[PDB]
Design an enzyme around this catalytic site. Structure first.
Site, mmCIF file in Angstrom:
data_model
loop_
_atom_site.group_PDB
_atom_site.id
_atom_site.type_symbol
_atom_site.label_atom_id
_atom_site.label_comp_id
_atom_site.label_asym_id
_atom_site.label_seq_id
_atom_site.Cartn_x
_atom_site.Cartn_y
_atom_site.Cartn_z
ATOM 1 C CG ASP A 169 -2.126 0.928 1.139
ATOM 2 O OD1 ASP A 169 -2.675 1.168 0.029
ATOM 3 O OD2 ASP A 169 -2.558 1.425 2.205
ATOM 4 C CB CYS A 203 -5.341 -1.470 -5.417
ATOM 5 S SG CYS A 203 -5.588 0.231 -6.037
ATOM 6 N NE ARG A 209 -1.986 -0.964 -3.518
ATOM 7 C CZ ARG A 209 -2.312 -1.642 -2.420
ATOM 8 N NH1 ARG A 209 -1.638 -2.721 -2.041
ATOM 9 N NH2 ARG A 209 -3.347 -1.236 -1.689
ATOM 10 C CB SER A 210 -5.912 0.629 -9.927
ATOM 11 O OG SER A 210 -6.352 -0.473 -9.161
ATOM 12 C CD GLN A 235 -3.541 8.788 -4.009
ATOM 13 O OE1 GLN A 235 -3.501 9.063 -2.808
ATOM 14 N NE2 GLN A 235 -4.143 9.574 -4.906
HETATM 15 O O1 LIG Z 1 -1.007 2.626 -3.493
HETATM 16 C C1 LIG Z 1 -2.177 2.668 -3.249
HETATM 17 C C2 LIG Z 1 -2.826 3.590 -1.993
HETATM 18 N N1 LIG Z 1 -4.221 3.368 -1.934
HETATM 19 C C3 LIG Z 1 -5.105 4.026 -1.010
HETATM 20 C C4 LIG Z 1 -5.501 5.305 -1.347
HETATM 21 O O2 LIG Z 1 -5.037 5.858 -2.539
HETATM 22 C C5 LIG Z 1 -6.348 6.028 -0.523
HETATM 23 C C6 LIG Z 1 -6.792 5.458 0.655
HETATM 24 C C7 LIG Z 1 -7.718 6.283 1.548
HETATM 25 C C8 LIG Z 1 -8.709 7.225 1.148
HETATM 26 N N2 LIG Z 1 -9.247 7.714 2.251
HETATM 27 N N3 LIG Z 1 -8.663 7.148 3.359
HETATM 28 C C9 LIG Z 1 -7.746 6.305 2.992
HETATM 29 C C10 LIG Z 1 -6.993 5.590 3.970
HETATM 30 C C11 LIG Z 1 -7.250 5.817 5.328
HETATM 31 C C12 LIG Z 1 -8.247 6.730 5.688
HETATM 32 C C13 LIG Z 1 -8.943 7.392 4.679
HETATM 33 C C14 LIG Z 1 -6.398 4.174 0.991
HETATM 34 C C15 LIG Z 1 -5.549 3.447 0.163
HETATM 35 F F1 LIG Z 1 -5.149 2.182 0.499
HETATM 36 S S1 LIG Z 1 -4.638 2.331 -3.199
HETATM 37 O O3 LIG Z 1 -5.374 3.183 -4.141
HETATM 38 O O4 LIG Z 1 -5.360 1.151 -2.717
HETATM 39 N N4 LIG Z 1 -3.176 1.956 -3.891
#
Ligand SMILES: O=C1CN(c2c(O)cc(-c3cnn4c3CCCC4)cc2F)S(=O)(=O)N1
Length: 298
Positions: free
Chosen positions: A187, A221, A227-228, A265
């Site tokens: 992540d 993801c 990651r997507s 991200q």
């Molecule tokens: O590298 C990657 C990171 N990812 C990702 C993301 O971008 C956003 C969030 C997200 C959005 N809001 N909140 C959170 C986390 C905790 C509280 C609130 C979580 C994730 F795991 S992902 O897209 O799965 N692939």
């Protein structure tokens, strides 16, 4: 044309960003240049339990609609880049109550493959529900009328392939779905090497699942953006280069962000994208005698 190699323009830009240590400033340029678009349906009160994260929503103009359902909403976006003859659906990891909607969309869109880039649990939080069976029991989704059965499992060091049987109970039909699971991509992190990511991508391509004779592949993801977004940007840029276009990676990513918010991200995920596109371009096969000599010497 130019005197450089097919990847020479991209390689020089990568070397300059490294020397000037400008990856963080470049990432911030991209964020500031990404426009916002209406996402009103996602914020309807009846859709609040269908969203994993309050700050990650599909845009109204590109959201995927569920057919013949009282509520047509799912947190999923269609990313279609006709210059590459490529179409993808990017989506969140489904919640316990939206697994049934996930499989209805897979059926209605005529998808052949699901690409999964996360683990179920990461840093002691659940990121995605268990939406396929791990043993020989049939897993039932009664709200939309689907059942799923495991047909085979092939485990490698950093990814696993499952073949799944998807049954439409209402229509009396079944289809074989290929499920490509990358198990070692953390992540907000990056894969272990360009070589490992590229071997995985070439296996997805070899199944035919990204070809125009199938519906769009489903890429996910946890939030469906970091990651997507990395996976889809690298695949699209490689197609355009094989076609012969002279591409600017910043421009391609901003264009893809018009279809789903926030693709890629972190600054390191951007740098990894450049690296995988340069090394993949050297693996391209074709007809040109000039391009083959460049590959040998590089
Ligand atoms: O590298 C990657 C990171 N990812 C990702 C993301 O971008 C956003 C969030 C997200 C959005 N809001 N909140 C959170 C986390 C905790 C509280 C609130 C979580 C994730 F795991 S992902 O897209 O799965 N692939």
């Amino acid at each position: 044309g130019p005197l450089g190699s097919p990847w020479g323009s991209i390689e020089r830009e990568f070397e300059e960003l490294d020397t000037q240590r400008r990856w963080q400033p470049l990432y911030l340029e991209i964020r500031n240049e990404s426009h916002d678009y209406p996402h009103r349906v996602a914020k309807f009160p009846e859709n609040r339990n269908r969203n994993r994260y309050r700050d990650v929503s599909p845009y109204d103009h590109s959201r995927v609609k569920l057919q013949n359902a009282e509520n047509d909403y799912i947190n999923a976006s269609l990313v279609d880049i006709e210059e590459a003859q490529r179409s993808y659906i990017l989506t969140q990891g489904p919640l316990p109550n939206t697994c049934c909607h996930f499989w209805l969309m897979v059926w209605q869109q005529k998808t052949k493959a699901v690409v999964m880039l996360n683990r179920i649990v990461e840093k002691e939080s659940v990121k995605c529900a268990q939406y396929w069976p791990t043993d020989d029991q049939e897993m039932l989704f009664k709200e939309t009328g689907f059942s799923v059965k495991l047909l085979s499992e092939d485990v490698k060091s950093y990814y696993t392939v499952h073949l799944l049987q998807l049954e439409n109970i209402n229509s009396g039909e079944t289809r074989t779905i290929s499920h490509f699971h990358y198990t070692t991509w953390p992540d907000f992190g990056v894969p272990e090497s360009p070589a490992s990511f590229l071997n995985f991508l070439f296996k997805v391509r070899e199944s035919g699942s990204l070809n125009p004779d199938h519906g769009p592949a489903v890429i996910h993801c946890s939030a469906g953006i970091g990651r997507s977004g990395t996976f889809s940007l690298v695949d699209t840029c490689l197609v355009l280069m094989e076609k012969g276009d002279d591409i600017n990676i910043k421009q391609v990513l901003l264009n893809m962000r018009k279809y789903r918010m926030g693709l890629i991200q972190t600054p390191d995920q951007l740098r990894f994208s450049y690296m995988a596109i340069i090394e993949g371009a050297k693996c391209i096969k074709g007809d040109s005698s000039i391009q083959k000599r460049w590959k040998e010497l590089s």
